[PDB]
Structure formats: C-alpha cells, structure tokens
C-alpha cells in the first residue's frame, strides 16, 4: 500500500474557529448538555447564558490542560512500568474588551445586580471586603464557515471559577481589556468538568469521515405511502423525513423533487401539499443515494 493511502489524511477534518464567543451563566442556571437544537439541529443556547461580547484578537482564547502524573517503579524493571494520571486541570483565558455587568462581576468577584445607577447614570463598583468564591457555567462556542455550511465546535464547562487576573496596563492608544483565567471544576449534577462537542451541517457531512457512528450507505425514508387532501385542512400537507442508515436525519442535505407536481407539490423542506387527486412520486437525492415515496392525494 502506498504512503498516501496509508496516511489517508483529510483536510476537511481541520476546523478553524473563525468566529468564537464565550457565554457565562450563573451557577443556578441549568447546565447546557448540548448546543444542537432538537427540532432542527441549529445553534441553541439555553436561557441564562449571556455572552461576554468582544475580546482581544491577538491574545485569542487559550485552553490549558495540566496533567499531574506519577510513575510506578518495578523492582525488576529499570524503566517505569506504568504512569498514573492523578488529575487533569482545565483552564481557559482570554482578554475581554466590553465593560458590561457580567464581565465586571466576573472580574470583581461580586454580584452587581443591586447596583443602582445614580441620577445621571454614574455607577460605582466596590470590590468586596473578602473576595467571593463564585462559580459560573461557560459555553465556548466557535464557528467555522465553510461553503455556507457552518461547523459549530464548542466546549461546555458546567462550573468555572476565576482563578487569576493578569495586570492591566492603561495606554492612551488602547482600550481597557480585562484578561481573566477561568478554571473548570467537575459538576456533580452533570458528572464532568469539560466537554467538547460538534454540530452543524458541515459536521453532519464530516461525522462519518471523522468516525463517529457508521458511514452513510442507505437512505431510508419516513413511511412512503402518505395520504394528503386537496382541500385545505389538517391533511392538506404532509412532512417527509429522510434518514440515513446511521440514524442521522439527512432531510436538509437531500434535495426534494416531485415527479408529478400536479398531485403533490413538494417544498424544499419536505412538505408535500395536495393539489390534485391521484398518485405522486417524491424523490430525495444526495450524491449517489436516492429515495422514493408514493403519495396518495384525495379530493
């Protein structure tokens, strides 16, 4: 076998976080189990998560993994036979620009919900007597826009705490930025400290190549004998689902066509509307794969 076939490298599996955002929520907010909308697989942020807005570009966002390790020595062996990873510490840091309430609360370890602006809008934010140990929920979601099929790759940290804050320098040519480091702790309710996830039409394309589940080879359809009504009513339209053999809905990816538009007019989303009584053929195509469904239309 030649070297290229052995390497079998795919460039499409390289994902560039073209636009990234960090969302913080109070510890009372229900943690985000996934960022994929159940109804249509879009980007769905749970309520309570609020973005920290813009942050510095050159600094970027840095994710840090620290391993505590211990070598195990054997009496009859010169090298260590095993190593134990006692713990894995996850942190992330970035340099926020905006001066909004959640950013300032995170920076000062204080709850500024009771801060009432003065008659002319001025506010004063006092640092607490003793620093307050406050935990938040973090969503670090980035988007790679490729051929109008975005890939949303995200990190979920159900419990983050301000670990350190670097010195900030005031320069008459630069805006004031706050650069905190946030350390992730394990949440008992969800059972993990950090999770990494992927979503989007691009990831739907690339999941089989990445190797999660099984490759798409068969294109099954929702029951292929639906009854629709010409007259307006409950049964004047019917929705069709196009699924793969690996339990993935490929309806957005496939192309809906109707061989007999007079009987059932098919939309892009997969809605067949009864127009004239008889039988119609609905076909959804995706590359080599094709689908077929015979729709009955009644006046």
């Amino acid at each position: 076998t030649d070297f290229y076939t052995i390497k079998d490298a795919q460039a499409d599996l390289a994902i560039a976080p073209l636009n990234l955002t960090v969302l913080l929520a109070p510890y009372s907010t229900t943690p985000a189990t996934t960022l994929e909308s159940p109804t249509d697989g879009s980007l769905a942020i749970p309520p309570g998560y609020k973005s920290v807005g813009h942050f510095e570009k050159q600094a970027g966002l840095t994710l840090g993994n620290e391993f505590d390790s211990k070598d195990i020595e054997a009496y009859g062996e010169p090298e260590p036979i095993r190593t134990i990873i006692n713990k894995r510490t996850t942190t992330f840091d970035f340099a926020m620009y905006q001066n909004q309430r959640n950013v300032l609360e995170l920076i000062w370890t204080q709850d500024f919900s009771n801060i009432q602006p003065s008659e002319f809008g001025g506010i004063v934010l006092e640092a607490p007597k003793v620093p307050k140990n406050i935990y938040y929920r973090a969503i670090l979601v980035g988007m790679d826009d490729r051929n109008d099929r975005p890939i949303w790759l995200y990190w979920l940290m159900p419990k983050v705490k301000l670990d350190k804050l670097d010195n900030q320098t005031l320069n008459d040519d630069n805006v004031i930025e706050y650069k905190p480091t946030l350390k992730a702790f394990r949440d008992d309710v969800v059972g993990y400290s950090v999770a990494q996830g992927f979503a989007g039409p691009g990831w739907r394309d690339l999941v089989a190549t990445a190797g999660f589940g099984e490759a798409l080879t068969a294109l099954t359809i929702t029951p292929g004998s639906p009854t629709v009504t010409v007259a307006t009513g409950a049964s004047h339209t019917a929705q069709l689902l196009v699924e793969g053999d690996n339990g993935i809905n490929y309806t957005p990816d496939v192309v809906f066509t109707s061989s007999a538009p007079d009987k059932a007019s098919v939309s892009a989303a997969g809605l067949v509307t009864g127009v004239a009584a008889g039988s119609a053929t609905i076909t959804a195509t995706k590359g080599a794969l094709t689908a077929t469904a015979t729709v009955t239309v009644t006046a």
């Binding site: 195990i72 020595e73 054997a74 009859g76 036979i81 134990i84 006692n86």
Partner: protein, 290 residues
C-alpha cells in the same frame, strides 16, 4: 529480570509472582527498596580487651523485611478483589512462603506479618485503582532454605548398620532430624565435624550416641536442633527419661560431610531410620563454596 524471580505462596496457598518473568499477572508487583532481604542479620559480640575490645561471638537476628507491593487493575472493582486477595495471602499467626529463584536454584523464606500493612495513598484507592501496600514481614527463622534432603533406610535383620551420606553445602550449620521406628536399640552419629563448642572437637570426631532401648510402638523423633526437644516418643512415653544425661550436641558444620554410621540392634522385626537434613543459606542466591 530473567535472572531473578520472586514468588509468594500465601497462608491460603495463593501463588503470586512479584518480580521476574510473569510478574504482575496476579495484579501485584514488587516496588524497589526492600530491606534486610539478602543477608542474614548477624550481630557480633565484643568484650573489653587489652587493645580495645575482643571478639566474643556472633548472634544471628530474626529478619525484619520491610518491602512494598503495588496492586493494580484497570477497574476499581477488580482492583478491590486483587487487594482483598493479597491481604488474604498473609497472616500473623501462620507463615507464608517467599521464594527466590535464580541460576543457583530456588530458596524460600517463611515470613509472617510483623504489624498491620499500610495500604493505599492519601485519597481513596478506588480513584487510581493502582495503589501500594507497605508490608513489614518478619522471618523468625532468618535463613533462606531449600527443600531438606530425606534418606530412608529400612532393614529386616535384628542387627544391621548403614552409612548415610551427609554433606553441608550451605554457609551455616544445620541440625539433623532422625525418625526411628521401634522396637530396637539405635546408635546414631553425633560427629563434632571439628566443632569445638564443647572443647571436644577432636575427641568427638567419631562420636556415637546410643538411644535408650525402645519398646514396641515407641517410635521416636530425634531432632538435634535447640528449638525442639531431642527425643519425642509418638505415644507420649518419656523416652528422654531413660537416657542418662546424654544428648546430641553437634550440628553439621558447613563444608563438611561423610558417611555417618547408623546402627540398629535388638530389633525383632527390623526397623526403619529416616534422616532429614536441612539446606540453610544466609542469602537468596550464592555460588556453592567449599
């Protein structure tokens, strides 16, 4: 390494390979830095003399072996099983065997728990499922042993005599055990082998001791070691009571051996004599010396 293999046979008969070929198959490996494991601890006595202190003798001490093992597995449940089995392989009252195998053969040490083991790290051991146990075992008998050599001599004649071939290949003296059947008058060797511990090294070179006449059913065990009584009758009779201030005083000195004579007389139905000779060493391995 393949030049050294360390095994443990527990009080319950479990077999563990701590080091060497096949180590860690039962889940437990041996950690480095084990102490008082190789040489038998001996303290030498010194008494005041004209030029400081004069040598007065030596006393062998019991072994106090402090070592560590590592019990490991991929899942905490099986790790707990392995740790429980390892603990079950030990006891305080009864001893377990610790074998060392090298090109010089296999030598074992009988060891028991001196104190409670010290297991696990500072946190709960189910996290790592790979935890060390600090063992402080002790060898009451501090000499490494090989299987003792047993020789049997059965005769049907009333009077007979035999020559038992005996030799001490170890570096320490050994004490012989005799199993004599009854009835009959036995004469057993008590050769000094040049040992001068009673100021009779040359006088007792060919010394023989006559046991008391044994009545029917009075089979005797004659153990020369100081730990055990010399004469024990299997039926509880006081055989030593008829033996007139006499004893077996001499062990088999290292590097010495010959055909020791055993005589039987007045045996209407013959008799059987068994000689057990221990093989004691001060090290787990050593080249033969002579």
């Amino acid at each position: 390494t393949d030049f050294l293999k360390i095994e443990l046979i527990g009080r319950d008969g479990s077999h563990w390979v701590l080091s060497g070929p096949g180590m860690g198959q039962q889940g437990v490996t041996l950690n480095p830095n084990l102490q008082q494991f190789y040489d038998a601890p001996v303290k030498t006595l010194y008494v005041p003399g004209p030029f400081g202190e004069e040598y007065a003798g030596k006393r062998v001490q019991r072994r106090e072996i402090v070592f560590s093992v590592q019990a490991y597995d991929e899942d905490p449940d099986t790790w707990s099983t392995v740790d429980s089995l390892w603990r079950w392989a030990w006891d305080y009252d009864e001893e377990s065997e610790l074998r060392v195998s090298t090109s010089d053969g296999t030598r074992f040490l009988k060891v028991r728990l001196m104190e409670e083991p010290k297991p696990y790290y500072e946190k709960d051991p189910h996290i790592t499922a790979d935890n060390p146990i600090v063992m402080t075992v002790t060898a009451t008998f501090p000499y490494w042993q090989d299987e003792p050599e047993e020789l049997i001599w059965t005769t049907l004649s009333t009077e007979d005599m035999t020559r038992f071939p005996v030799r001490n290949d170890g570096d320490v003296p050994v004490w012989l055990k005799w199993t004599l059947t009854a009835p009959g008058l036995w004469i057993l060797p008590d050769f000094s082998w040049g040992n001068d511990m009673y100021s009779r090294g040359r006088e007792d070179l060919g010394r023989t001791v006559a046991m008391p006449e044994l009545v029917a059913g009075e089979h005797v065990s004659v153990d020369s070691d100081p730990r055990v009584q010399t004469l024990i009758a299997v039926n509880g009779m006081p055989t030593q009571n008829r033996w007139k201030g006499n004893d077996l005083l001499y062990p088999l000195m290292p590097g010495k051996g010959a055909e020791i004579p055993v005589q039987l007389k007045n045996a209407p139905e013959g008799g059987a004599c068994k000689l057990t000779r221990p093989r004691w060493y001060s090290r787990p391995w050593s080249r033969p010396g002579v």
